[PDB]
Amino acid sequence: MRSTQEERFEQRIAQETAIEPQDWMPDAYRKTLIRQIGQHAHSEIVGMLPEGNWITRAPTLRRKAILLAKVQDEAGHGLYLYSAAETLGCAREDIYQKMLDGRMKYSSIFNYPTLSWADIGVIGWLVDGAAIVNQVALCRTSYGPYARAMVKICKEESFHQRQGFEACMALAQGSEAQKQMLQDAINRFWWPALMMFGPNDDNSPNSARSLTWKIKRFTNDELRQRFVDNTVPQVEMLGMTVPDPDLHFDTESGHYRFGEIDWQEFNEVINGRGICNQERLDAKRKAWEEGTWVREAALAHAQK
Amino acid sequence: MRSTQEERFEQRIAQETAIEPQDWMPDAYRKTLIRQIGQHAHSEIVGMLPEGNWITRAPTLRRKAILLAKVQDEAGHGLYLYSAAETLGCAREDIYQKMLDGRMKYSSIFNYPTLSWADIGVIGWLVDGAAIVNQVALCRTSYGPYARAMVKICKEESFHQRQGFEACMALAQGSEAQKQMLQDAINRFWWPALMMFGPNDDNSPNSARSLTWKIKRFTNDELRQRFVDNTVPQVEMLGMTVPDPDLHFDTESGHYRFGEIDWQEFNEVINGRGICNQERLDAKRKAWEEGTWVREAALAHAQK
Amino acid sequence: SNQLTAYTLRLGDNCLVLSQRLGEWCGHAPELEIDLALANIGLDLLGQARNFLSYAAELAGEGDEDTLAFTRDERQFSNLLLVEQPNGNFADTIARQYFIDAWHVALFTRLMESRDPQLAAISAKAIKEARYHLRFSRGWLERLGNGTDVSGQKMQQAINKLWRFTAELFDADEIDIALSEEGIAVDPRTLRAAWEAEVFAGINEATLNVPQEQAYRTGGKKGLHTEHLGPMLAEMQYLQRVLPGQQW
Amino acid sequence: SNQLTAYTLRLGDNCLVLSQRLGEWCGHAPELEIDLALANIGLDLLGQARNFLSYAAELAGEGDEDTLAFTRDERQFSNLLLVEQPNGNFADTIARQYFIDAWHVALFTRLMESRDPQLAAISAKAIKEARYHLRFSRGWLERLGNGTDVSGQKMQQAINKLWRFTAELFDADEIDIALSEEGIAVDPRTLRAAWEAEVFAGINEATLNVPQEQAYRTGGKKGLHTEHLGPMLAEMQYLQRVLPGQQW
Numbered sequence A, B: 001m002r003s004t005q006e007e008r009f010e011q012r013i014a015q016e017t018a019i020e021p022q023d024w025m026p027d028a029y030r031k032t033l034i035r036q037i038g039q040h041a042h043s044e045i046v047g048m049l050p051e052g053n054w055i056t057r058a059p060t061l062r063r064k065a066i067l068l069a070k071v072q073d074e075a076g077h078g079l080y081l082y083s084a085a086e087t088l089g090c091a092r093e094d095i096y097q098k099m100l101d102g103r104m105k106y107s108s109i110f111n112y113p114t115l116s117w118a119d120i121g122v123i124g125w126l127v128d129g130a131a132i133v134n135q136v137a138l139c140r141t142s143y144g145p146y147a148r149a150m151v152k153i154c155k156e157e158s159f160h161q162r163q164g165f166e167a168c169m170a171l172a173q174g175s176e177a178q179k180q181m182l183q184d185a186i187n188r189f190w191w192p193a194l195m196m197f198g199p200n201d202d203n204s205p206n207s208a209r210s211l212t213w214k215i216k217r218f219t220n221d222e223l224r225q226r227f228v229d230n231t232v233p234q235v236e237m238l239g240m241t242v243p244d245p246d247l248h249f250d251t252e253s254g255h256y257r258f259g260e261i262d263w264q265e266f267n268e269v270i271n272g273r274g275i276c277n278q279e280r281l282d283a284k285r286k287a288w289e290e291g292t293w294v295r296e297a298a299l300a301h302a303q304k
Numbered sequence C, D: 001s002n003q004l005t006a007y008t009l010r011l012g013d014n015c016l017v018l019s020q021r022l023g024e025w026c027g028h029a030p031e032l033e034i035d036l037a038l039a040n041i042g043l044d045l046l047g048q049a050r051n052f053l054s055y056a057a058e059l060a061g062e063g064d065e066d067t068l069a070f071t072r073d074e075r076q077f078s079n080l081l082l083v084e085q086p087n088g089n090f091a092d093t094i095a096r097q098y099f100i101d102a103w104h105v106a107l108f109t110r111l112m113e114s115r116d117p118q119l120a121a122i123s124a125k126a127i128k129e130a131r132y133h134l135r136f137s138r139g140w141l142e143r144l145g146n147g148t149d150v151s152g153q154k155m156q157q158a159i160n161k162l163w164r165f166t167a168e169l170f171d172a173d174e175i176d177i178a179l180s181e182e183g184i185a186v187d188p189r190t191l192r193a194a195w196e197a198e199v200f201a202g203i204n205e206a207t208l209n210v211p212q213e214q215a216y217r218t219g220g221k222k223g224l225h226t227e228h229l230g231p232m233l234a235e236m237q238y239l240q241r242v243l244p245g246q247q248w
C-alpha cells in the first residue's frame, strides 16, 4: 500500500494540480528536481562561456550588442533557475560547488568550442532552438516554481534564438567564404544540438519516474523528433545541408527520419571527456577562487 | 698634494694604460663606472621590452626571426655588462634591485612605446645607431673590462642595426601605407634617439670627471653631432624626412645644424614620468616577483 | 565639421574601448550577479559607442560605426588612455570604472545642454545609464576599500595604479576649446571640480587615500596610446580585416 | 603530394605555434638567462617552421612560409593541441616544452631516415636543436620538481594539466600511415615507447608522478583546435590581414 501522503500526491499529479514548495512530495521527486533544475541552472552559467568566447571578436557592433544582451539574459536565467531549485530546500552555493567539483552535470552542448563567428549564430539558432523545444515542453512540468521559471525564460529566449537565426541568414546570403563558414559551424554543431534532448527512450534511467510524476511531459525521443521536424525547413531556408546521410522525409509517418546519434561520444562528453569539459570547469573554478576575496569583502562590509 | 696612489693613477690615465680590476682607482672613478656600466647593463634589459612588444606580431617569419635573435643578443649584452660592473666589486643582484626600485637609471629611449611595426625597424636603425656611436666611442674608455665589453658588443650590434635599416628600406620602397608608417615612426623616435647621447655639455654633471679620467672620450654634444651627420644621409636614402624645421647643412663648418632638444621632456623622462616608465618597471618587477619561486627552486636543487 | 567629428569620435572611442574591456569579464566574475552587472554596463557603453560613432560617420559624410570601429588602427583611435588599461583584478576594473563613470556623469550632465542637437540627445540617453554605472562602481569601491584588510589594500593599489591617467580627463586641446566657445563641447578642464568632489568623497568614504602623485599621462585623444591598445584592436578587428566589406 | 604537403605542414605548424608562445616570454622570465634560453628555443623552432612551411609551399606549387603562416585561419592550422596551450606559469611552460622536446627528439631521429630527401635534411638540422631543447626542458623539470615543496607542487600541477593533450603525440591518421608505408613519414604510434621511456624517467627523477588520467584530447591535426588558437592567430596575423600582399 502507498501511504496516504503518497496517494494524495499521485492524485494531485493525475489532476494536473501544480506542486508547490510547501506541499508534501516523495523524497525521490524532490531530489530529481534538485538534480534537474540545478543542472538546468548550471547549464545557463557554463553556457555563457562558448558564446562569450566571441564577444570581443564579434564582426559588427550590432552583433556584438546582441551577443552581450544574450549572455546577460543567460545569467539572469541561471538566477531564476537557482531560485526555483532553492524552493526545494537545496542551497545555490552548495549545488554550484557540486558543479565545480564535477558531481553535478551541465548540458553536454557547452563542451564544444567556438571556432568561428558562424558558431555563434548557429548556437543561437540550434542550441537555443533545442533549449526552447525542451523548455516549452516543460511549461506544464508538475512542479509550479519550475513551470513558472520556464514561462518567464522562453519569452526572452525565443527572441535571441530568432537573432541567432538572423545572424545565420546574413552569412547564408553573404559571400562564398561566409556561406562556407556557416556550413562548417552547422557541420560541427548539428549532432551536439540533437544530444541536448538526452539519451534514447530505452537508455534513459530517469524517464520512468519523471514521466509518471509529470516532470517530463514528452520523451527525449519525442522532443528530439519535434526539433528535427521544425529545424530541417530552417536549414533549407538557409540553403544549407545537414551532416546526416540518413536524413530523409518519410511521407507515411509525416516525420523526418534521421541517422543514429554517436552515443559513445555522448557518454564521453557527459562524463567529463569532451572537447572543452576541462577548460569550462577550469574557467568556472578560476572565477570562483580568484573571486573569493571579493565575496569576503562584500560579506565583511555588509556586517559593519 | 695628490697622494702617490692618486698621482700614479693620473699618470696611467694620461699614458692610455687600461685600468684593470686589481689596480688602485679613485673611489669616485670606481663608483661612476658602477653607475655607468650598471645603467648601461640595465638598458639592455629594459630595452628588450619595446621591441619585444612586437615579436608576436611581426609581419613576416624572416623579420620575426631577426627580431628574436636581436632581443636575444640584447640579453647577452646585459650579461656582458653585468660581468664588467662586478669586476668593480658591485653585485649584479644588488644593482638590478636598485633598477627595479628606481634608484638606478636605464636609457631614456626605452620609455617610448612601439605603436606600429615600423617602430621596430626604426629602433634597430636609429636607437641601435645611436648606441653604436656611443659604444664605439667607448672602445677606448679607460677601464679595461668596459672597453673590452664594448668591443665584443659592437661586433654583434652593428649587424642588427643594418637589419633594422633594411626593414626600414622595405617600408620605404613599399606601398603608400608602408611609407606613411615609416615616416610616423621616425617622427616619433627621432628626438628620443638624439636624447640617448645625454644632456648638453654645460648641463652635464658627470662630464668633467668622466672626460678627465678618460671614461668619456667624446662629449655628449660631439657624439650627438656625429650621429646627426651620419644619419641624415640615411634618412635621405629612405626618401624620408626629419621632424626638425631647423635642420640644415652648414657648408662653412661641414656639419648639419639641428634644432633644440626638448630638455623639459628629457628631464620628465629620466625622472620616471615618460610615456612608458611605469609600464617598463612594472613588467620587470612582475617578472622578478613572479619568478621568485623559480629562483628559489634552482637554489634549493643545487644545494641537494 | 572636422573638429566636431573628432570630438564626437573621442566620446565614441572611450565607450567602445571600455566596452571591449568589460566584454572580457563575461563569465569570469566573482559572483553571477557581478557577471550580469558588468555585461549590462558593457552593453550600455557599447550602445553609447554606436550612437557617437554613427553620428561621427554621418558628420564625415562616409562610413558607419563599423568602418570606424574595425578599419582604423591604433594611431587613429582617440579613446582616453584610462579605458584601455587591462582588467587586472576586480579592484583594477572597479577603479577604472569608478573614474570613468564619475567623469561620464559630470560630462553628460553638461553635454545634454550642447548647442548641437544630436550631441544633446545622445548625452540625454547616456547620462541616465552613467548614473546606474556610478552607483555600481562607487558601491564596489566602498565594499572593497571598507571590506577586509586584504580588499582594502587591493582597492588602494588599484587606485594608485590608475591615477596617472586621470590627467587626460581634464586635458583640453583646441578641438575641445573651439567647440566649447561655440557652446557645443564641454571644456574638459571645467570638469575637474565635479569629478574631484565625487571621487575624493568616494575614496574617503571607502576609507582610502587619494594618491599624492600628480597625474601626468595623456595622448590617447591624439592617437598616442599605451602598448595595450594594439593587441586589443588586433583581437577586436580580426574577422573584419580577414573578410572586409561584408554584411553580418 | 596532397598527403606529403599536409604532413609537412603539420610539423611546420607545431613549430610555428610553439615558437609564438615562447615569443611571449621575452623579457618576462624569472632570470635573464632563462629569457635568453627561451628566446633561443623560440628562434630554433621558428627556423624549423620556416623550413617545413617553405617546403610545404614548394610542394603545393604556390605561396610561401608567409602565405601559410598569415593567411590560413584556425580551421586550416594543423598544429598539435599541446603547442597552443597558454604559457601559464613557468612550470606550465616547462611541462609543455619537455613533452614536445622529448617528442621532437624521438621524431626527428627517425624522420632523418625519411625516403623524402628534403624531409630528411630538415630533420637532420632540427634534431641537433631538439637535443639542446630537451636538455634545458628536462633540466628545469628536475630543478623544479626536486626543488622546493612549492616548486614540486607547481611542477606536478603543470604535468597534470597538460597530460590529456599527449594522446595526439601518438595519434595516427591515414596521412601518417600512408606516408609511413612509403617510408616517408614516421607512424606516430611507434613513437610511444621512446617518448614514454624518456618522459616517465624524467618525471620519476624529478620525484614526480606520471598522471593516471588516460590522455584523450586530439583534433589539432584536423584543424579542430582548443579556444586558444583563434586569439593567437588574431594577434599573429593582424598586420598581414590589414596590409595584405606586401614585402616587409
Ligand SMILES: CC(C)(COP(=O)(O)OP(=O)(O)OC[C@H]1O[C@@H](n2cnc3c(N)ncnc32)[C@H](O)[C@@H]1OP(=O)(O)O)[C@@H](O)C(=O)NCCC(=O)NCCSC(=O)Cc1ccccc1
Binding pocket: A035, A036, A039, A040, A041, A043, A044, A047, A048, A074, A105, A106, A107, A108, A109, A123, A127, A128, A131, A134, A195, A196, A197, A198, A199, A203, A204, A205, A206, A207, A210, A216, A220, A270
Ligand atoms: C532532457 C534532460 C537533459 C535529461 O533527461 P533526464 O530524464 O533528466 O535524464 P536521463 O535519464 O534521460 O539521462 C541520463 C543522465 O545523463 C543526463 N543527461 C541527459 N542528457 C544530457 C545532456 N545533454 N547533457 C548532460 N547531461 C545529460 C541526465 O541528467 C542523467 O544524469 P543524472 O541522473 O542527472 O546524473 C533533462 O534533465 C532536462 O530536460 N533538463 C532541463 C533542460 C536543461 O538542463 N537545459 C540546459 C541546456 S539549455 C540552456 O542552458 C540554455 C542556453 C542555450 C544557449 C546558451 C546558453 C544557455
Ligand SMILES: CC(C)(COP(=O)(O)OP(=O)(O)OC[C@H]1O[C@@H](n2cnc3c(N)ncnc32)[C@H](O)[C@@H]1OP(=O)(O)O)[C@@H](O)C(=O)NCCC(=O)NCCSC(=O)Cc1ccccc1
Binding pocket: B035, B036, B039, B040, B041, B043, B044, B047, B048, B074, B105, B106, B107, B108, B109, B123, B127, B128, B131, B134, B195, B196, B197, B198, B199, B203, B204, B205, B206, B207, B210, B216, B220, B270
Ligand atoms: C652618455 C651617458 C648616457 C650619460 O652621460 P653621463 O656623463 O654619465 O651623465 P651626464 O652627467 O651627462 O647626465 C646627467 C644624468 O642623467 C643621465 N643620463 C644622461 N642621458 C641619459 C639618458 N639618455 N637616459 C637616462 N639617463 C641619462 C646620467 O646617467 C646622469 O645621471 P646619473 O648621475 O647616472 O644618476 C653615459 O652614461 C653613457 O655613455 N652610458 C653608456 C651608454 C648606455 O647607457 N647605453 C644604454 C642605451 S643603448 C642600449 O641599451 C642598446 C640597445 C638598443 C636597442 C635595443 C636594446 C638595447
